[PDB]
């Protein structure tokens, strides 16, 4: 049965966040554009195999929208982490296996590097170090500009558009409307931040993937450090969201990669 | 300028070869399609700034078709490298920097590993590590449907369609005939005898690079392989067929990167 609510933390932020299952925790960050129905299907899967999944909408979007402009401007992985660290001491999350793409993989990062007693085991997927050309001045546009154009990116990046389509008006309506905030806070910021740095890979076991159909240079970075730094990496069918385009695979990693960090 | 002739090594093949330029040499292996024709516009890039080129026809392929069964069966990365020290022996180059693609890559890689006393330096790209499933059961099907399916396979690798198109009527009806032979002699073998082992990649310099376009997932092992050896590794334009979607920056790589060994 999946739990689904509000929640208020002390930082002013009104979160929407769902749950499902039991035993050890499992925490889906979602990934830019902040919609945690993304993870619907996953989450079942995941939670059917004996663990407790948490999931939610980032702080401005979607669901989550009930939240000061900061927790959405000049974003960062670090930022985002102290928030989430917030929400899992609200949610009473001690430990967990945590998953994040994008900006959410740069909140994984962080995590592991400055809050390394809180996870279990981290799964960062293309983890963003660089600024695509396409983007670069999205954040100059108007805000229908940013949407229409943020929409397609994101649809050819769904690595299934049928999927993609699939997640329904609701869904596509929320992401519409996150796209310009996203736009706004997230691309200047977030590359450059990213916790990959020596330091910011050892303190926890990382399992790090990115998109078998991702164009190779998009996160060629990623493999490199991961390779150099002797950090698993390893693709994932898809490109960037996984989640959505193979749901029965991303699941089977998630747990495969969780099962092998607990006792 | 450019000579273009054939040669009749000691080991039965009647090669076609084109050399151009002068000062130290520089050998353009071609992929699996063994069609030198591809290489016409770099090649002159790369004369005019003091180099020798060598190219020539892979042995059973294009204009290089007369030549024994044997060296067009059960290839691998040590096969095509004997075969090219004796033509290197016959065109008395002594030393040189080698690129490759594929199953050229596979000799570059050969060459560097056994014959590293004629390399100067390595320069693979996208070293096939594993039989694609694409192409599974390539031959398993009529030689026309190979040449159609293989045809299109290409051409979608090609990084550039209207590059790849421009190759010319002449070079499309000689890859015609290529592509069945190269389906029965490549693929399957190709793969499984790539020279990637640590001992085989330290005893000369190596610059290995991956399609910028080519999804991730196919040449992932290429990076991995790199990244942990401590060898250079890059990207370049395009997918499999650099050398004909970007020429000029194809032609400026190789010169940069022989020209920093030269001594």
Redesign the interface.
């Given at each position: 049965t999946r739990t689904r609510g509000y929640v208020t933390t002390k930082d002013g932020i009104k979160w929407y966040y769902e749950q499902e299952g039991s035993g050890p925790d499992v925490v889906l960050i979602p990934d830019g554009l902040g919609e945690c129905q993304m993870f619907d299907k996953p989450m079942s899967l995941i939670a059917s195999n004996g663990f407790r999944v948490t999931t939610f909408d980032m702080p401005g979007m979607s669901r989550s929208s009930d939240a000061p402009p900061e927790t959405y401007q000049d974003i960062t992985g670090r930022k985002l982490a102290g928030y989430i660290i917030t929400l899992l001491d609200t949610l009473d999350i001690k430990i967990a296996s945590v998953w994040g793409c994008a900006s959410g993989a740069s909140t994984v990062l962080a995590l592991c590097s400055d809050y390394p007693e809180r996870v279990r085991n981290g799964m960062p997927h293309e983890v963003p170090t660089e600024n695509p050309d396409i983007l670069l001045h999205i954040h100059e546009v108007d805000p229908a500009t940013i949407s229409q154009e943020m929409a397609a990116n994101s649809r050819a990046a769904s690595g299934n558009v049928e999927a993609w389509d699939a997640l329904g008006p609701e869904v596509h309506a929320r992401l519409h409307d996150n796209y310009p905030r996203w736009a706004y806070g997230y691309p200047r910021t977030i590359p450059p931040s990213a916790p990959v740095k020596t330091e910011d890979l050892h303190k926890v076991p990382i399992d790090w993937t990115?998109?078998?159909?991702?164009?190779?240079?998009?996160?060629?970075e990623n493999?490199?450090i991961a390779?150099?730094e002797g950090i698993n990496?390893?693709?994932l069918p898809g490109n960037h969201f996984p989640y959505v385009s193979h749901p029965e695979e991303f699941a089977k990693y998630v747990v495969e990669t969780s099962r092998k960090y607990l006792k």
């Amino acid at each position: 049965t999946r739990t689904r609510g509000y929640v208020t933390t002390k930082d002013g932020i009104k979160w929407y966040y769902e749950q499902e299952g039991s035993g050890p925790d499992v925490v889906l960050i979602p990934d830019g554009l902040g919609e945690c129905q993304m993870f619907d299907k996953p989450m079942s899967l995941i939670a059917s195999n004996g663990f407790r999944v948490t999931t939610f909408d980032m702080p401005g979007m979607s669901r989550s929208s009930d939240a000061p402009p900061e927790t959405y401007q000049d974003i960062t992985g670090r930022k985002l982490a102290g928030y989430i660290i917030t929400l899992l001491d609200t949610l009473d999350i001690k430990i967990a296996s945590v998953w994040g793409c994008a900006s959410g993989a740069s909140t994984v990062l962080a995590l592991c590097s400055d809050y390394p007693e809180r996870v279990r085991n981290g799964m960062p997927h293309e983890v963003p170090t660089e600024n695509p050309d396409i983007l670069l001045h999205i954040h100059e546009v108007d805000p229908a500009t940013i949407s229409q154009e943020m929409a397609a990116n994101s649809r050819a990046a769904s690595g299934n558009v049928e999927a993609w389509d699939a997640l329904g008006p609701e869904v596509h309506a929320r992401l519409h409307d996150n796209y310009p905030r996203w736009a706004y806070g997230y691309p200047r910021t977030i590359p450059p931040s990213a916790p990959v740095k020596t330091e910011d890979l050892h303190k926890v076991p990382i399992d790090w993937t990115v998109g078998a159909s991702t164009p190779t240079k998009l996160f060629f970075e990623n493999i490199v450090i991961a390779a150099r730094e002797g950090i698993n990496i390893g693709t994932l069918p898809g490109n960037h969201f996984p989640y959505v385009s193979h749901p029965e695979e991303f699941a089977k990693y998630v747990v495969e990669t969780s099962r092998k960090y607990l006792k």
